[PDB]
Amino acid sequence: SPFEISLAQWSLHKAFFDKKADPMDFAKIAKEEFGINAIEYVNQFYKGKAEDQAFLADLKKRADDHGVKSLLIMCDGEGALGDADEAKRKKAVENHYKWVAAAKYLGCHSIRVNAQSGGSYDEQLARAADGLRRLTEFAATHDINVIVENHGGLSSNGAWLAAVMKKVDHPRCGTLPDFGNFRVSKDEMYDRYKGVEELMPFAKAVSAKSHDFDAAGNEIHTDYRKMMKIVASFGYKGYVGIEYEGSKISEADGIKATKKLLETVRSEMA
């Protein structure tokens, strides 16, 4: 009731890439291995399939059969939406159209894209705002949001990405705040609490990033109590997606630890 828990597919990326699990069973696996009934896909596990009507029908059916909600698709490898090269930015925008349609088909509310760009602060802001606005124009006709997750570079700068949002100036372009992605560069780690707070006014989804847990089951890098307080203070009551990216405990344990942490924190909320 304070919020709901979903699973983001990158939590299982090692299992899928090593062919120890079938991407098509993502809904089943979330539901049966982890007791989770909402998912966020990553397009890397379905390369070439976005316009395959039979594949979409199948993926939608497996979700329906297991009573799992499809929330959004995270899009990687389709180009930089703020590419300094004009022709490449245009191509990046168009590469996402198919994923917009796929998301609509599955009943997702958004696609998550990057704001990758090049040049100084204001050049990147103008370029990213341009690509995002152009893609959002297409997506809006499908009643689908375009949202950016902080993910390195200036996109990990909360104020820069918030300024990009303001420049894009479209209600269907928003953010997907990630708890942990705040390394702007080797020399700069942005304040994750300030950054999420800067991104929350635009949030359509939230990503509970985790890596490592202590003996009490608390995440070592991010204080989830403090973080969820920030999230809730903006009235966000939707799904919070587990995105386990640690290297010490297995993905299965990582997912379970994150779910358990989120549940504990949620029980303290009312």
Tab-separated table of C-alpha atoms in Angstrom:
chain	number	residue	atom	x	y	z
A	1	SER	CA	0.000	0.000	0.000
A	2	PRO	CA	2.785	2.500	0.628
A	3	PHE	CA	4.278	1.100	-2.629
A	4	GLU	CA	4.543	-2.134	-4.561
A	5	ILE	CA	7.528	-4.247	-5.485
A	6	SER	CA	8.516	-5.177	-9.024
A	7	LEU	CA	11.510	-6.911	-10.546
A	8	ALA	CA	13.816	-5.384	-13.163
A	9	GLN	CA	15.240	-7.890	-15.621
A	10	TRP	CA	18.889	-6.870	-15.281
A	11	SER	CA	18.810	-8.512	-11.805
A	12	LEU	CA	18.911	-11.778	-13.730
A	13	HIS	CA	21.216	-10.763	-16.551
A	14	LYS	CA	23.903	-13.304	-15.669
A	15	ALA	CA	21.329	-16.160	-15.633
A	16	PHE	CA	19.896	-15.154	-19.028
A	17	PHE	CA	23.216	-14.383	-20.777
A	18	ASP	CA	24.715	-17.684	-19.540
A	19	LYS	CA	21.620	-19.463	-20.938
A	20	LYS	CA	20.652	-20.852	-17.543
A	21	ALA	CA	17.207	-19.339	-17.913
A	22	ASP	CA	14.950	-18.460	-20.828
A	23	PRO	CA	14.085	-14.719	-21.157
A	24	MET	CA	10.572	-15.819	-22.190
A	25	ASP	CA	10.046	-17.211	-18.652
A	26	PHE	CA	10.874	-13.873	-17.037
A	27	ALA	CA	7.296	-13.472	-15.747
A	28	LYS	CA	7.158	-17.069	-14.523
A	29	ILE	CA	10.525	-16.762	-12.798
A	30	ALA	CA	9.639	-13.489	-11.068
A	31	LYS	CA	6.358	-14.932	-9.829
A	32	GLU	CA	7.465	-18.452	-8.808
A	33	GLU	CA	11.133	-18.087	-7.761
A	34	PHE	CA	10.740	-14.688	-6.108
A	35	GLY	CA	7.079	-14.097	-5.256
A	36	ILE	CA	6.960	-10.954	-7.412
A	37	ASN	CA	3.987	-10.093	-9.630
A	38	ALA	CA	5.266	-7.120	-11.648
A	39	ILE	CA	8.203	-6.881	-14.050
A	40	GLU	CA	10.349	-4.446	-15.994
A	41	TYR	CA	11.917	-5.893	-19.143
A	42	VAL	CA	15.306	-5.123	-20.636
A	43	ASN	CA	15.285	-5.092	-24.456
A	44	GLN	CA	18.758	-6.771	-24.658
A	45	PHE	CA	17.110	-10.124	-23.887
A	46	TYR	CA	14.725	-9.853	-26.875
A	47	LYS	CA	16.987	-8.518	-29.610
A	48	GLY	CA	15.359	-8.442	-33.031
A	49	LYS	CA	11.924	-9.317	-31.668
A	50	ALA	CA	10.177	-5.976	-31.102
A	51	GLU	CA	7.986	-6.119	-34.202
A	52	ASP	CA	7.408	-9.854	-34.076
A	53	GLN	CA	3.633	-10.004	-33.467
A	54	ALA	CA	3.751	-13.673	-32.504
A	55	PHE	CA	6.502	-13.001	-29.969
A	56	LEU	CA	4.575	-10.115	-28.415
A	57	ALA	CA	1.412	-12.242	-28.202
A	58	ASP	CA	3.432	-14.990	-26.531
A	59	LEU	CA	5.214	-12.705	-24.061
A	60	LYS	CA	1.884	-11.055	-23.172
A	61	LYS	CA	0.249	-14.445	-22.631
A	62	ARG	CA	2.957	-15.760	-20.323
A	63	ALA	CA	2.564	-12.656	-18.191
A	64	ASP	CA	-1.224	-13.000	-18.123
A	65	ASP	CA	-1.079	-16.732	-17.262
A	66	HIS	CA	1.184	-16.110	-14.299
A	67	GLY	CA	-0.778	-13.062	-13.126
A	68	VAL	CA	2.225	-10.772	-13.689
A	69	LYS	CA	1.966	-7.070	-14.593
A	70	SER	CA	4.195	-5.709	-17.412
A	71	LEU	CA	5.326	-2.211	-16.363
A	72	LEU	CA	7.925	-0.845	-18.754
A	73	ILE	CA	10.702	-1.720	-21.156
A	74	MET	CA	14.258	-0.602	-20.566
A	75	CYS	CA	15.943	0.163	-23.839
A	76	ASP	CA	19.679	-0.293	-24.362
A	77	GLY	CA	21.828	-0.391	-27.496
A	78	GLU	CA	19.500	1.710	-29.703
A	79	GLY	CA	21.799	4.753	-29.902
A	80	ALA	CA	22.421	7.920	-27.869
A	81	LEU	CA	19.359	10.120	-27.628
A	82	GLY	CA	21.596	13.182	-27.229
A	83	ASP	CA	24.112	12.129	-29.877
A	84	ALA	CA	26.235	15.117	-30.953
A	85	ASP	CA	25.962	13.826	-34.525
A	86	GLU	CA	22.634	14.967	-35.974
A	87	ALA	CA	22.099	11.950	-38.214
A	88	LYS	CA	22.833	9.572	-35.329
A	89	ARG	CA	20.438	11.350	-32.946
A	90	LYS	CA	17.646	11.090	-35.514
A	91	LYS	CA	18.424	7.394	-35.982
A	92	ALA	CA	18.510	6.868	-32.196
A	93	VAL	CA	15.042	8.387	-31.873
A	94	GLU	CA	13.614	6.213	-34.690
A	95	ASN	CA	15.259	3.055	-33.317
A	96	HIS	CA	12.986	3.362	-30.274
A	97	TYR	CA	9.663	3.519	-32.149
A	98	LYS	CA	9.423	-0.296	-32.281
A	99	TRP	CA	10.006	-0.540	-28.532
A	100	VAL	CA	7.281	2.035	-27.948
A	101	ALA	CA	4.842	-0.144	-29.921
A	102	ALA	CA	6.014	-3.290	-28.135
A	103	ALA	CA	5.478	-1.583	-24.757
A	104	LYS	CA	1.967	-0.528	-25.757
A	105	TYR	CA	1.207	-4.082	-26.876
A	106	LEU	CA	2.285	-5.577	-23.547
A	107	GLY	CA	0.422	-2.965	-21.514
A	108	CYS	CA	3.542	-1.176	-20.259
A	109	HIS	CA	3.194	2.459	-19.219
A	110	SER	CA	6.681	3.607	-20.346
A	111	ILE	CA	9.957	2.877	-22.058
A	112	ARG	CA	13.205	3.792	-20.299
A	113	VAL	CA	15.845	5.335	-22.498
A	114	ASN	CA	19.222	7.091	-22.046
A	115	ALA	CA	20.187	10.733	-22.227
A	116	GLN	CA	23.675	10.024	-23.538
A	117	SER	CA	25.310	13.002	-25.197
A	118	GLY	CA	28.644	14.771	-25.853
A	119	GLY	CA	30.129	18.255	-25.461
A	120	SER	CA	29.980	20.681	-22.538
A	121	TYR	CA	27.113	20.885	-20.000
A	122	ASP	CA	24.742	23.051	-22.092
A	123	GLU	CA	25.492	21.349	-25.423
A	124	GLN	CA	24.531	17.981	-23.882
A	125	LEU	CA	21.451	19.491	-22.252
A	126	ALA	CA	20.216	20.868	-25.606
A	127	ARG	CA	21.055	17.619	-27.480
A	128	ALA	CA	19.493	15.280	-24.930
A	129	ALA	CA	16.409	17.510	-24.620
A	130	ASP	CA	16.083	17.454	-28.408
A	131	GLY	CA	16.220	13.650	-28.794
A	132	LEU	CA	13.937	13.024	-25.803
A	133	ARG	CA	11.325	15.540	-27.002
A	134	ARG	CA	11.329	14.043	-30.476
A	135	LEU	CA	10.892	10.504	-29.185
A	136	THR	CA	8.258	11.645	-26.655
A	137	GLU	CA	6.259	13.160	-29.560
A	138	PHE	CA	5.979	9.686	-31.105
A	139	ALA	CA	5.361	7.895	-27.804
A	140	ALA	CA	2.604	10.253	-26.714
A	141	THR	CA	0.533	9.107	-29.705
A	142	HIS	CA	0.665	5.615	-28.189
A	143	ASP	CA	-0.170	6.874	-24.696
A	144	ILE	CA	3.268	5.802	-23.525
A	145	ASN	CA	5.837	7.721	-21.446
A	146	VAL	CA	9.531	8.205	-22.264
A	147	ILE	CA	11.604	8.197	-19.098
A	148	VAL	CA	15.292	8.586	-18.374
A	149	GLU	CA	17.186	6.614	-15.660
A	150	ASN	CA	20.317	8.221	-14.223
A	151	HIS	CA	23.143	6.135	-15.656
A	152	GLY	CA	26.550	7.827	-15.617
A	153	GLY	CA	27.883	11.047	-17.089
A	154	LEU	CA	25.646	14.098	-16.774
A	155	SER	CA	22.561	11.856	-16.487
A	156	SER	CA	23.903	11.083	-12.986
A	157	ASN	CA	23.851	14.807	-12.244
A	158	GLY	CA	20.403	15.333	-10.679
A	159	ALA	CA	20.205	19.030	-11.524
A	160	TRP	CA	21.311	18.473	-15.139
A	161	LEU	CA	18.742	15.736	-15.771
A	162	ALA	CA	16.033	17.756	-14.011
A	163	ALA	CA	16.939	20.720	-16.272
A	164	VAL	CA	16.684	18.400	-19.307
A	165	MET	CA	13.167	17.442	-18.157
A	166	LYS	CA	12.189	21.079	-17.861
A	167	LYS	CA	13.539	21.803	-21.349
A	168	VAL	CA	11.722	18.803	-22.872
A	169	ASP	CA	8.572	20.273	-21.310
A	170	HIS	CA	6.253	17.386	-22.065
A	171	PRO	CA	4.082	15.610	-19.497
A	172	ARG	CA	4.932	12.208	-21.008
A	173	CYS	CA	8.673	12.612	-20.638
A	174	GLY	CA	9.865	11.837	-17.115
A	175	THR	CA	12.453	10.130	-14.959
A	176	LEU	CA	13.216	6.724	-13.551
A	177	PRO	CA	15.299	7.534	-10.473
A	178	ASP	CA	17.868	4.806	-9.695
A	179	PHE	CA	19.169	4.670	-6.101
A	180	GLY	CA	22.775	3.914	-7.012
A	181	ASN	CA	23.647	5.249	-10.479
A	182	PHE	CA	25.352	8.485	-9.415
A	183	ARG	CA	28.884	8.210	-10.677
A	184	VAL	CA	29.104	11.191	-13.074
A	185	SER	CA	32.747	10.358	-13.731
A	186	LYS	CA	35.797	8.710	-12.145
A	187	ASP	CA	36.369	11.892	-10.142
A	188	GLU	CA	32.775	12.607	-9.239
A	189	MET	CA	30.170	10.731	-7.252
A	190	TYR	CA	26.959	12.761	-7.028
A	191	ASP	CA	24.960	12.786	-3.738
A	192	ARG	CA	22.363	10.035	-4.327
A	193	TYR	CA	19.805	11.442	-1.825
A	194	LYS	CA	19.960	14.951	-3.324
A	195	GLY	CA	19.882	13.481	-6.850
A	196	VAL	CA	16.848	11.226	-6.364
A	197	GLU	CA	15.089	14.138	-4.683
A	198	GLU	CA	15.905	16.312	-7.723
A	199	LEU	CA	14.500	13.642	-10.039
A	200	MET	CA	11.380	12.670	-8.109
A	201	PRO	CA	9.138	15.492	-9.453
A	202	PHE	CA	9.280	13.752	-12.844
A	203	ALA	CA	9.311	10.120	-11.697
A	204	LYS	CA	7.058	7.588	-13.470
A	205	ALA	CA	8.928	4.633	-11.996
A	206	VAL	CA	11.632	4.078	-9.376
A	207	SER	CA	14.604	1.673	-9.476
A	208	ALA	CA	15.768	0.122	-6.214
A	209	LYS	CA	19.415	-0.474	-7.132
A	210	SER	CA	21.316	-2.842	-4.793
A	211	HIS	CA	24.815	-4.382	-4.678
A	212	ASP	CA	25.821	-5.456	-1.181
A	213	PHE	CA	24.107	-6.176	2.167
A	214	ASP	CA	25.364	-6.273	5.766
A	215	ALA	CA	24.711	-8.870	8.525
A	216	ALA	CA	21.358	-7.254	9.278
A	217	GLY	CA	20.219	-7.318	5.659
A	218	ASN	CA	20.591	-3.575	5.097
A	219	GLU	CA	22.064	-2.377	1.820
A	220	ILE	CA	25.601	-1.116	2.461
A	221	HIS	CA	25.798	1.781	-0.071
A	222	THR	CA	22.281	3.166	0.127
A	223	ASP	CA	20.162	3.711	3.240
A	224	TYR	CA	16.800	2.364	2.037
A	225	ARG	CA	14.816	3.869	4.936
A	226	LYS	CA	16.132	7.313	4.158
A	227	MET	CA	15.776	6.741	0.432
A	228	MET	CA	12.156	5.495	0.592
A	229	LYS	CA	11.246	8.490	2.807
A	230	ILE	CA	12.421	10.778	0.011
A	231	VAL	CA	10.487	8.751	-2.560
A	232	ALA	CA	7.272	8.760	-0.496
A	233	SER	CA	7.515	12.490	0.280
A	234	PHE	CA	6.710	13.139	-3.395
A	235	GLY	CA	3.563	11.038	-3.110
A	236	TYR	CA	4.978	8.166	-5.150
A	237	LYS	CA	3.039	4.993	-4.396
A	238	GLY	CA	3.658	2.968	-7.548
A	239	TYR	CA	6.058	0.111	-8.175
A	240	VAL	CA	9.616	0.159	-6.946
A	241	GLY	CA	11.711	-2.200	-9.080
A	242	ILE	CA	14.455	-4.416	-7.692
A	243	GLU	CA	17.610	-3.998	-9.731
A	244	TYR	CA	20.340	-6.143	-8.168
A	245	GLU	CA	23.763	-5.569	-9.680
A	246	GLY	CA	26.136	-6.894	-6.998
A	247	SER	CA	29.092	-9.187	-7.584
A	248	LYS	CA	29.382	-11.014	-4.266
A	249	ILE	CA	26.125	-12.821	-3.532
A	250	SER	CA	24.270	-14.608	-6.310
A	251	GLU	CA	21.559	-12.824	-8.265
A	252	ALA	CA	18.966	-15.034	-6.589
A	253	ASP	CA	20.158	-14.026	-3.111
A	254	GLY	CA	20.572	-10.399	-4.197
A	255	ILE	CA	16.999	-10.219	-5.387
A	256	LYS	CA	15.714	-11.866	-2.217
A	257	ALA	CA	17.720	-9.531	0.027
A	258	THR	CA	16.413	-6.466	-1.835
A	259	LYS	CA	12.819	-7.684	-1.697
A	260	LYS	CA	13.150	-8.397	2.024
A	261	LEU	CA	14.641	-4.932	2.650
A	262	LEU	CA	11.890	-3.195	0.688
A	263	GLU	CA	9.254	-5.157	2.595
A	264	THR	CA	10.755	-4.246	5.962
A	265	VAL	CA	10.933	-0.578	5.049
A	266	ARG	CA	7.413	-0.637	3.684
A	267	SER	CA	6.050	-2.163	6.904
A	268	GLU	CA	7.493	0.796	8.822
A	269	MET	CA	5.580	3.140	6.548
A	270	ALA	CA	1.898	3.970	6.824
